[PDB]
C-alpha cells in the first residue's frame, strides 16, 4: 500500500526500510532526519507508494529552534542506499555493493527524478551525499580522519561548509540532454573532512544523471586525509538540507519518483 513515517508522531527519529521482496534486505531506507532541530511546532511526513514507487515529503515546521547553530542547517530528510554510518540503518539490495572500499568499486551512474517545492524563500538544497569511513559497517558516527562528500544539484540561498577550492566541469545528463556542467568544489573541516560540489546551474525539478566517480575522484585528489584508499564508500544518500540559523519557519514539499544506480565497466577512482 503506502509506507508513511511522520515527525513528531513517530518520535525524534522517524525512518523505515523500503523492502519490496520482503527478504529483510531493504532496497532503500528513508528518514525524516531533522537532525539539528531541538524543538519545532508542526510536522513533517514522508510517504512511499509501494505501487507507483513515488516518495513524497511534506513539511510544515514552525517556531524552529536548533540544537547547535554552528551546524547551520536544520536537517536532511532523505532516502539512501548502503550503510548509513550514523545509525543502525541500511539498505543493500541493489546492484552496487556498498559499503566497499573506493579502491575496489567500479564507477556507476546515479539517476534521480524529482521535483522540489520549497516555500516562502526557504534556503534549501537537493544534495546527494556519501560518507567514506575506515570501518565498512560503522553505526556510531564519523571520526576526524574520515570524509563526507556532497553533490548539490539544486540550491537556493544555502552555501556549502568551508571554502571554495576550484571549479570543475563534469558531463552529466539533465532531462535527457548531455550537459557539461560546472560545479564549484568546496572543502571544510567540520569534525571530519567535507567536500561539496555545488552545481552552478541548479535544477529544481527533472531527471538528472551523474557519473559518481567524477566526483569521488576529485574528492580523493583534493583530500588531506591519510590512506584515502583504505576508506569504504558507505552509501549514497539523497535528500534536501534546509534552513539556516536565520530560518524559523520551514515549509517544503517534494517528490522523488525514481532513483537508479547503474554500474559501469571502469573503476570508481580514475
Ligand atoms: Ca529486499
Ligand atoms: Ca518556508
Author numbering: 50 to 319
Publication text:
The hyperthermophilic glycoside hydrolase family endocellulase 12 from the archaeon Pyrococcus furiosus (EGPf; Gene ID PF0854; EC 3.2.1.4) catalyzes the hydrolytic cleavage of the β-1,4-glucosidic linkage in β-glucan in lignocellulose biomass. The optimal and denaturing temperatures of EGPh are 100 and 103°C, respectively, and those of EGPf are 100 and 112°C, respectively. EGPf appears to be a secretory enzyme because of its signal sequence at the N-terminus.
Based on initial screening results, high-quality crystals of EGPfΔN30 were obtained using a reservoir solution consisting of 100 mM CHC (2:3:4 citric acid:HEPES:CHES) buffer pH 5.5, 200 mM lithium sulfate, 5%(v/v) ethanol at 22°C. The average size of each crystal was about 0.7 × 0.5 × 0.3 mm after one week. This was a new crystal form with symmetry consistent with space group C2 that diffracted to 1.68 Å resolution. The final model contains two monomer molecules with 270 amino-acid residues each. pH5.5, poor electron density was observed for the loop regions of B3–A5 (Gly131–Asp156), B5–B6 (Thr182–Asp194) and α-helix–B4 (Ser272–Glu283), but the regions were interpretable. Comparison of the EGPf structures obtained at pH 9.0 and pH 5.5 reveals a significant conformational difference at the active centre and in the surface loops. Glu178 seems to play a role in controlling the optimum pH of the enzymatic activity.
